[PDB]
Scaffold this active site. Structure first.
Site, mmCIF file in Angstrom:
data_model
loop_
_atom_site.group_PDB
_atom_site.id
_atom_site.type_symbol
_atom_site.label_atom_id
_atom_site.label_comp_id
_atom_site.label_asym_id
_atom_site.label_seq_id
_atom_site.Cartn_x
_atom_site.Cartn_y
_atom_site.Cartn_z
ATOM 1 N N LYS A 15 -1.743 0.797 -2.703
ATOM 2 C CA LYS A 15 -3.041 0.472 -3.289
ATOM 3 C C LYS A 15 -2.760 -0.147 -4.646
ATOM 4 C CE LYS A 15 -3.562 3.905 -0.323
ATOM 5 N NZ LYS A 15 -2.505 3.022 0.255
ATOM 6 N N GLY A 16 -3.808 -0.608 -5.315
ATOM 7 C CA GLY A 16 -3.654 -1.346 -6.563
ATOM 8 C C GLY A 16 -4.985 -1.872 -7.050
ATOM 9 N N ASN A 20 -4.862 -4.344 -2.168
ATOM 10 C CA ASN A 20 -4.257 -3.436 -1.176
ATOM 11 C C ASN A 20 -3.257 -4.188 -0.296
ATOM 12 O OD1 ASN A 20 -5.817 -0.584 -1.202
ATOM 13 N ND2 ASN A 20 -7.377 -2.183 -1.480
ATOM 14 N N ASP A 130 9.118 -10.816 -16.423
ATOM 15 C CA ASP A 130 8.697 -9.408 -16.351
ATOM 16 C C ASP A 130 9.582 -8.628 -15.384
ATOM 17 O OD1 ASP A 130 7.131 -7.126 -17.071
ATOM 18 O OD2 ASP A 130 5.737 -7.530 -15.447
#
Ligand SMILES: CN1C(=O)c2ccccc2N(C)c2nc(Nc3ccc(N4CCC(O)CC4)cc3)ncc21
Lengths: 270, 43
Positions: A15-16, A20, A130
């Site tokens: 999830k996020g 998803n 990143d």
């Protein structure tokens, strides 16, 4: 040409925010991949449309065994679907947390795979910006996969100004408000190597300003258990002056990398 | 959760895919994609 009905949905993988990922099987080839599902309305309300376009543009044009592949993408009334490579061993940060720290063989292997992927990106003037465990996944035999290109930029000509990335991984030049280039990734690779081997990043502090201070002073303090080869590699990446940092080809050829990496190249189609 | 997606059927299918990769470039990369400009537009 693809739609959601071209796929059997297996189970959620993560999830996020937006956000998803599912294990999915493309029907006609029975090919297992992952589908990242984004909601158009939420993206637009959040004003991240151009952000997502740029991540898609970058990642969909990269083809490398240590970069998570974006095979294709499609959309329907409400959702955008990204068809991505499935990384069967999952999140590298989870594995690092589970073990605390990685041995030299594991770290050196990951370092070789990282430097090879980043070199492919830099060849194309893509800076990732990143690199940290949380943005890496693991393939069927543990191969590193650069998975998220959220801060990434195609930078053919102009140096860059955007402060981006993650506090513990920031290069001195970003903290200092200077323009930066692809050599930011060399710095973050050294941070990563340290965190792999120690389990904490090198400039860990209670506060953002104390962390900023440790970074710009390159206040690096190696625990006594590290080999001289691993310190040698980290010291050559964590250099205050971007042009003095070890080039990625330099990382791949580093003796500690050669002596410890057990890198395997995935089988290729033919 | 369907069968293909758990435990042994899955690992088995993942191993097969790894050692017998397809031409993903031909199978997926030759297929049409929406224009990046159209992504937030009518489907
Ligand atoms: C496309 N994509 C991404 O865009 C992605 C980008 C950044 C971070 C995460 C991502 N996710 C969720 C993904 N996870 C996996 N693979 C995957 C495989 C296995 C697992 N598990 C191992 C441990 C078990 O407890 C749960 C299942 C999780 C994720 N493959 C592809 C992913």
């Amino acid at each position: 040409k693809f739609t959601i009905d071209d796929f059997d949905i297996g189970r959620p993988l993560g999830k996020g925010k937006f956000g998803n990922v599912y294990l999915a099987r493309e029907k006609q080839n029975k090919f297992i991949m992952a589908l990242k599902v984004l909601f158009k309305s939420q993206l637009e309300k959040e004003g991240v449309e151009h952000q997502l376009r740029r991540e898609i543009e970058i990642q969909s044009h990269l083809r490398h065994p240590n970069i998570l592949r974006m095979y294709n993408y499609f959309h329907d009334r409400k959702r955008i679907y990204l068809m991505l490579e499935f990384a069967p061993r999952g999140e590298l940060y989870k594995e690092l947390q589970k073990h605390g720290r990685f041995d030299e063989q594991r770290s050196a292997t990951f370092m070789e795979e990282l430097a090879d992927a980043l070199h492919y990106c830099h060849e194309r003037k893509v800076i990732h910006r990143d690199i940290k465990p949380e943005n890496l996944l693991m393939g069927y035999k543990g191969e590193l996969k650069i998975a998220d290109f959220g801060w990434s930029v195609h930078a053919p000509s102009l140096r860059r100004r955007t402060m981006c990335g993650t506090l513990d991984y920031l290069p001195p030049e970003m903290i200092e408000g200077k323009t930066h280039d692809e050599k930011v990734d060399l710095w973050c690779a050294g941070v990563l190597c340290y965190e792999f081997l120690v389990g904490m990043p090198p400039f860990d502090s209670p506060s953002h300003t104390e962390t900023h201070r440790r970074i710009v002073n390159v206040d690096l303090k190696f625990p006594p258990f590290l080999s001289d080869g691993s310190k040698d590699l980290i010291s050559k990446l964590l250099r205050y002056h971007p042009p003095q940092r070890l080039p990625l080809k330099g990382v791949m050829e580093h003796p500690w990398v050669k002596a410890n990496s057990r890198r395997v190249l995935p089988p290729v189609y033919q | 959760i369907p069968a293909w997606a758990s435990g042994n059927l899955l690992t088995q299918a993942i191993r097969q895919q790894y050692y017998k990769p397809i031409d993903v470039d031909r199978m997926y990369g030759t297929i049409d994609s929406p224009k990046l400009e159209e992504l937030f537009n009518k489907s």
